[PDB]
Amino acid sequence: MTLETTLFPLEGLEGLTASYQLYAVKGLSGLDETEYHKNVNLLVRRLSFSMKAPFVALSRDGEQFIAVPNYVTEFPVDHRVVRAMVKLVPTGEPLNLRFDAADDEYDGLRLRYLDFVLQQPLFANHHLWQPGSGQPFFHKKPLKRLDDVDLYDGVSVRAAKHPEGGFGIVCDARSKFITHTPIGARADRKRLGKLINRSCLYKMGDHWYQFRIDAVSDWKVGEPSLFEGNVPISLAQQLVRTAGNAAPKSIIDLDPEGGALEYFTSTNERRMAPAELCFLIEDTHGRRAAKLQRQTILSPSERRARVNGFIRRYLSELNIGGAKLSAGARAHAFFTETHMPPALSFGNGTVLAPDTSKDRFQAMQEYSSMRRTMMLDKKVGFFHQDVFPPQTLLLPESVKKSWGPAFASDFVGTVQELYPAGGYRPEIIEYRDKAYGGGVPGQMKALLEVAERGEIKSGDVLVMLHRINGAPRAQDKLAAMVCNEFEKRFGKRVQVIHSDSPGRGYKRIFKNDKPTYVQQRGRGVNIKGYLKGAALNKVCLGNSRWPFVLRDPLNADVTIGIDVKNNMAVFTMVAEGGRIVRVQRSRSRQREQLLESQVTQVITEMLSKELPEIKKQVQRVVIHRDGRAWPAEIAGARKTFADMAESGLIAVDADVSVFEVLKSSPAPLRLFSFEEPTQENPKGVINPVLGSWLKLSENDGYICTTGAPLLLQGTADPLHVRKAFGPMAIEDALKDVFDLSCLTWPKPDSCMRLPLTIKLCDIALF
Known about the structure:
- The chain is an alpha+beta fold.
- 27% of the residues lie in helices and 27% in strands.
- It has a domain at 549-765: Nucleotidyltransferase, domain 5 (2-Layer Sandwich), CATH 3.30.420.10.
- The protein has an eight-stranded mixed sheet with strand order 36-35-34-37-38-43-42-41, sandwiched between helices.
- β41 (693-695) and β42 form a beta hairpin.
- α15 (596-610) packs parallel to α16.
- The radius of gyration is 29 Å and the shape is globular.
- GO terms for molecular function: nucleic acid binding.
């Protein structure tokens, strides 16, 4: 019950002046929304870099408001580029922010100043470096060698509210992989062309930083490519002109014939960097280098050790205006009650409840196992049991002619054993996967023409696609294409599997003097496991046959997940206790953001259909956003529900709350609990228990949706949720985030870090 954080308190901030002066930006007041905030955050960075002061943006009312420190002297007030010229009219009332104070709306302002000053000792340490603004600091010396790629260890350091009052520091260990040798001066023009969009570490003498390769320069390092006052100057000459004092040999003795790269500054200037000084960052999720990935998974005691070691070594001294701000040696620790997993309802009126008489750890593991075994027991089974509507299995022709039939036979039987009530009996159809070209167009040509023939009787289809590109850090545009077209022109609900992984499970055999495909089970896939998993996710879940639901009400009557990536939005809606789940995709006019009118359309459309099956009057709605919530999205959700409270579809005093679900947290914190130290674990640090949680603030909490009994390796990564709007108390949102993440439908005997609401969003996009 004893949990330690990676929160370290900050002392000697006791009544420290932080003085600001609000300005407001007239700009180009046309708000393209996504474009409006790119430029806002563009100017704050440009202004911050040029005057070396903590400029911030405060989005309330007009969403402008750049906060200028009172201590800056000359201030341009007018700023060029940015299309139409911008003007900043000061809003008076200079704010002297205290750090001993209660919660303000200027706490975002206070956290930014605190953030800015905290990285000055770090940015000045010659032995550390930072990839870009806002990122962790890494040691210049690599931790580990790993045979042509280097492993660098870093620590993110972010300011945050302390739940006992005042301010503190949250940290986490990070790893970055960089190839050991540079690109090199001798690498030729064609090889350099092949690196566009990759990112490399640039050791520009003592200033190390990261950039993205945008183009290859027409000019080598020693040929004049720009000018320092009219006169043409080589890149080699430029690095000499901007070196200091005892510049390293490496930056003044560059091969004149080496090539140079070009990149854009975080203010969009173009710069060059010599390939002799550039080191490719190894995207290991792009190229499966898993022995590399293994070096990155740290035990809880390693992770704790690296963070505490870092704290005591680099944030020990910090003089800001003389002030002596110490980071305490003791991370914040507290006693808390841990959420028990919720009672669950299965088929045949059977509930699964955590056993409160066994000890917590043994009870959680029995519980987690029982979600699978109850789901599979023909005596209890799925909560929702019914015949499937007609189904279709759409296979490539090359597959129907080889192992398709054995796979389909095995697959149907797997569905019927997992979900006996369904009577899965799919029509098996094919498309001419070799008639048109095997790229995305051509695969799609054959698919549309099967559709156009009307060969997909039935509204549900499971179609087997070929993998076009691998690289798990890619976009499978074929799958999205098939769903967009099959949903939009025909009435199809489509689920996707690929042909490579099941195909590895079958080998051809000669039996009774006839070729046959039979399962194999050496190395490559576990075909039985694949068959069970695909049966649950593609057939059962794809027909909304939920295996189990919450027995008890969440704090919210309805929670809606929202993710938008790559101009495609997903809305999931969970009501009852997961008894009612709906997922709508919709195209988006911006890459990662939604128009207000679009939010209000999709949600009233989705909810209106479902309201007659929500048999309790609705009075709490929650929205879970993946990442940042945008003001136009909030307006659409408050408008949607204020409307329904007036129609009578919902309680006249219903309320909305908006929470950002930060699967990639901007302020990542760890939680540990403790154990007897034991040879193998000299400090006795273990993962936190499954339901552990911590709030820092009314707006910021963390729940271990993953944790002690149920993790295989590594240390639990607490899910950061941040309150964007609304009455609901942050503690309540964390509790039913936890309860929603116990609906582990894609893999019941496992833990699941995301609540079901936004997990369904990642599934629908991925």
